[PDB]
Amino acid sequence: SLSPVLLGIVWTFLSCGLLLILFFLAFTIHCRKNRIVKMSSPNLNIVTLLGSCLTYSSAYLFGIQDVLVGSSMETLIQTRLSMLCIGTSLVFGPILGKSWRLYKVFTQRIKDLQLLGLVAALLMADVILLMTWVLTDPIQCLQILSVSMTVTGKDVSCTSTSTHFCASRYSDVWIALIWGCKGLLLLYGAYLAGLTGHVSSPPVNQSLTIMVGVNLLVLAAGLLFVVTRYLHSWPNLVFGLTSGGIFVCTTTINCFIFIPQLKQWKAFEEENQTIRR
Amino acid sequence: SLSPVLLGIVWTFLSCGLLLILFFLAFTIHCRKNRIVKMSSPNLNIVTLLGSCLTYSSAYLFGIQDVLSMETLIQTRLSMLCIGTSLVFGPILGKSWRLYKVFTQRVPDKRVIIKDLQLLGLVAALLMADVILLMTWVLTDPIQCLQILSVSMTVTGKDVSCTSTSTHFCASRYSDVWIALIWGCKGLLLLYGAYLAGLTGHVSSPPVNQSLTIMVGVNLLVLAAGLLFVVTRYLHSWPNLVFGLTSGGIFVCTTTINCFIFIPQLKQWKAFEEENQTIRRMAKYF
Numbered sequence: 001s002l003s004p005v006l007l008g009i010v011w012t013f014l015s016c017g018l019l020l021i022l023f024f025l026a027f028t029i030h031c032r033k034n035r036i037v038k039m040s041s042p043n044l045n046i047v048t049l050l051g052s053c054l055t056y057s058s059a060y061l062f063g064i065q066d067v068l069v070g071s072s073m074e075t076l077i078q079t080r081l082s083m084l085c086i087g088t089s090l091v092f093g094p095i096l097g098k099s100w101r102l103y104k105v106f107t108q109r110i111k112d113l114q115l116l117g118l119v120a121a122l123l124m125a126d127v128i129l130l131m132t133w134v135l136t137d138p139i140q141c142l143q144i145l146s147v148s149m150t151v152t153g154k155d156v157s158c159t160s161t162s163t164h165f166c167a168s169r170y171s172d173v174w175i176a177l178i179w180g181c182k183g184l185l186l187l188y189g190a191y192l193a194g195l196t197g198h199v200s201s202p203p204v205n206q207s208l209t210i211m212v213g214v215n216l217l218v219l220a221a222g223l224l225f226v227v228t229r230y231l232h233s234w235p236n237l238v239f240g241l242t243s244g245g246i247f248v249c250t251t252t253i254n255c256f257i258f259i260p261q262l263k264q265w266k267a268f269e270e271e272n273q274t275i276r277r
Numbered sequence: 278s279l280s281p282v283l284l285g286i287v288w289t290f291l292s293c294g295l296l297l298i299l300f301f302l303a304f305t306i307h308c309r310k311n312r313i314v315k316m317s318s319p320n321l322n323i324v325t326l327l328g329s330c331l332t333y334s335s336a337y338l339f340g341i342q343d344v345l346s347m348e349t350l351i352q353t354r355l356s357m358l359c360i361g362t363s364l365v366f367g368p369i370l371g372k373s374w375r376l377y378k379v380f381t382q383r384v385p386d387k388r389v390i391i392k393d394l395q396l397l398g399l400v401a402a403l404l405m406a407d408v409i410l411l412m413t414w415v416l417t418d419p420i421q422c423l424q425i426l427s428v429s430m431t432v433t434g435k436d437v438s439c440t441s442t443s444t445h446f447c448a449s450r451y452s453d454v455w456i457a458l459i460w461g462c463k464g465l466l467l468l469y470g471a472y473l474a475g476l477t478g479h480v481s482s483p484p485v486n487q488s489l490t491i492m493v494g495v496n497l498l499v500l501a502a503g504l505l506f507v508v509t510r511y512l513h514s515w516p517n518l519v520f521g522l523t524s525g526g527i528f529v530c531t532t533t534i535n536c537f538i539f540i541p542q543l544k545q546w547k548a549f550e551e552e553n554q555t556i557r558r559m560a561k562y563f
C-alpha cells in the first residue's frame with residue numbers, strides 16, 4: 001500500500017542523514033585531540049551519534065509492511081518502537097550530561113565516567129519500562145469485526161466495522177509512562193539549559209540545542225501520536241509524517257551540536273596556517 | 278453513586294484549601310504596601326490565587342455524578358481546570374521573566390511599553406490560547422454522552438473469541454486530538470517555564486526568585502496529569518477511586534504551588550515586623 005515514490009524519497013533522505021551522521025562520527029574520532037574538538041567532549045558525542053543512527057534505523061523500519069520472511073509484525077512494531085526509545089534516550093543523555101558538567105564547573109568546581117554512569121542509569125530506566133511493557137502485554141495484532149448500536153437518547157444508529165490494528169490491551173498506560181518519563185527528563189534538561197545560559201560559546205554551551213530539541217521532540221511526538229491514532233487509513237501519510245519527524249528532529253539536533261565544532265575547527269586551522277607562514 | 282464518606286472528606290479538604298487561598302488573598306490585599314509583599318508581585322499573585330480558586334471549584338464539580346446537562350457539566354469542569362492552570366502558571370512565568378530581564382539589561386533597553394506588553398503577553402496570550410482551543414473543542418467536537426450496545430467477534434492468529442459489552446461514557450469523537458493539543462501547548466509553555474526557572478536559578482531569594490516553585494509545579498503537574506488521564510481512561514468502573522484521585526491531584530498541585538509562593542512571604546513579613554518592633558521598643562526605652 002506504500003507508494004514506491006514515497007519509499008524512494010524517504011530512503012534517500014534517511015540515507016543522506018546517515019551519511020551526515022557518519023561524517024560527524026569520522027570527524028569526532030579522527031580529530032579527537034584537537035583543542036576545539038577536545039573541549040566539546042568528543043567521547044560523549046559518540047553516544048549521541050550512535051543514538052542518532054539508531055533513530056534513523058527505526059525510521060527505516062517504520063516503512064515496511066506485512067512480514068520480512070514469514071515473520072511477525074508484532075516483533076517489528078515492538079523492535080522499531082523500542083529502537084526509537086533507546087535512540088532518543090542515547091541522543092538526549094550526553095547533551096544533558098555536558099550541560100550538567102558545565103554548570104558544576106561554573107559553580108564550585110567531573111570526569112566522563114560519572115556522566116556515562118548517569119546516562120547508563122537513564123538507559124536502564126528506559127530498558128526497564130520497555131521490558132515490562134513487552135512482558136506484561138505484547139502488541140498482538142487482532143482482527144476486530146463487530147456491530148454496534150449507538151443510543152444517544154435521541155437517535156439510533158447501527159454501524160458494522162471490520163478493523164485491524166496492532167496494539168496493546170492497555171496501550172495508553174504505556175504511552176503515558178514513556179512520554180511522562182521522557183517529559184520529566186526534558187523538563188530537567190530545559191532547567192539545565194537555562195542554568196548554563198550564556199555561560200560559554202555554543203561549542204561548549206549546549207543550551208540552544210536543548211531548547212530546540214525539546215520543542216521539536218514535543219511537537220513531533222504529539223503530531224505523530226495523533227496521526228497514528230486517527231489517520232490509520234492513510235499509510236502513506238503516516239509513514240511520510242513519521243519519517244519526516246524523526247529525520248527533522250535527529251538532523252536538527254546533530255547539526256546544532258556539530259556545525260559550531262566544524263566551523264570553529266576550520267577557523268582555528270586557518271589561523272594556524274596564517275601564523276605559520 | 279459516590280460514597281458520602283469520601284464526598285465529605287474531599288469536600289472538607291477542598292474547603293480547607295479554599296480557605297487557605299482566601300487567607301493568602303487577604304494577606305496580599307491588606308499588606309500590599311509592605312516591603313516584603315511589594316518586592317514580590319502582589320497584582321500577579323492575585324491572578325494566581327483566582328486560578329487556584331478556579332481549580333478548587335473544578336475539583337468540587339468533579340464529584341457530581343448521576344444528578345444532572347451532564348455533557349455541559351463535564352465541559353465546564355474541564356474548561357475550568359484548563360483556565361485555572363493557565364491563570365496559576367502564567368503569573369509565575371511572568372515574574373520569572375521580569376526578574377530575568379531586570380538583571381540582564383544592556384545598552385539596547387528597548388522600550389518600557391514593549392517590556393510591559395511582553396509581560397502582559399506571557400499571561401493573557403496563554404489564556405487566549407487556551408480559550409480558543411476550548412472554544413474550538415466545544416464548537417467542533419462537543420462531549421456527547423452516548424450508550425453503545427455492541428457484540429465483538431475478534432480473532433487472534435489461532436483463537437476465536439466473542440464478547441458482548443454495553444457501556445455508557447461521555448467523550449468527544451476525536452477526544453485524543455484535543456488532549457494532545459492541550460497537553461502539547463501546556464507542555465511547550467511549561468518547558469519555557471523550566472528554561473526561565475533555570476535562567477533565574479540563583480538570582481535572588483525564594484520570595485522573589487520563583488525557580489523552585491516552577492520546578493516543583495511542572496513536575497507535579499506532569500505526574501498528576503499523566504496519572505489522571507490514565508485512570509480516567511481505564512478505571513472508569515471505579516467512580517470513587519477516580520473522583521478521589523482527581524480531587525487529590527488537583528488539591529495537592531494547587532496547595533503546593535500556593536504554599537511555595539506564599540509561605541516565604543509570610544516568613545519574611547514576620548521577620549521584618551519583628552525587627553521593626555525590636556527597634557521601636559529599643560528607641561522608646563531610651
Ligand SMILES: CCCCCC/C=C/CCCCCCCC(=O)OC[C@H](COP(=O)([O-])OCC[N+](C)(C)C)OC(=O)CCCCCCCCCCCCCCCCC
Nearest residue numbers: 081084085088167168171178179182183221224225229249
Ligand atoms: C530525537 C529523535 C526522536 C524523536 C522522534 C519522535 C517520533 C515519534 C513517532 C513515534 C510515536 C508515535 C507512535 C505511537 C505507537 C504506535 O505506533 O502504536 C502502537 C501502540 C499504540 O497504538 P495506537 O493507540 O497509537 O493505535 C491503536 C488505537 N487503539 C484504539 C486500538 C488503541 O504502541 C503502544 O502500545 C505504546 C508503546 C510505547 C513505546 C514507546 C514508543 C516510542 C517512543 C519514541 C518517543 C519518545 C521520546 C519523545 C516523547 C515526547 C516528549 C516527552
Ligand SMILES: CCCCCC/C=C/CCCCCCCC(=O)OC[C@H](COP(=O)([O-])OCC[N+](C)(C)C)OC(=O)CCCCCCCCCCCCCCCCC
Nearest residue numbers: 355358359362448449452463464502505506510527530531
Ligand atoms: C494547578 C492545579 C491544576 C492541575 C490539575 C491536573 C489534573 C488534571 C486532571 C484532569 C485530566 C484528566 C481528565 C481527562 C478528560 C476526561 O475527563 O475525559 C473526558 C474526555 C475524554 O474522555 P476519555 O478518553 O478519557 O474516556 C473515554 C475513553 N475512550 C476510549 C472512549 C476514548 O475529555 C476530552 O474529550 C478532552 C477534553 C480536553 C479539555 C482539557 C482537559 C482538562 C485540562 C487540565 C490539565 C491541563 C494542564 C496540565 C497539562 C499537562 C502538563 C503539560
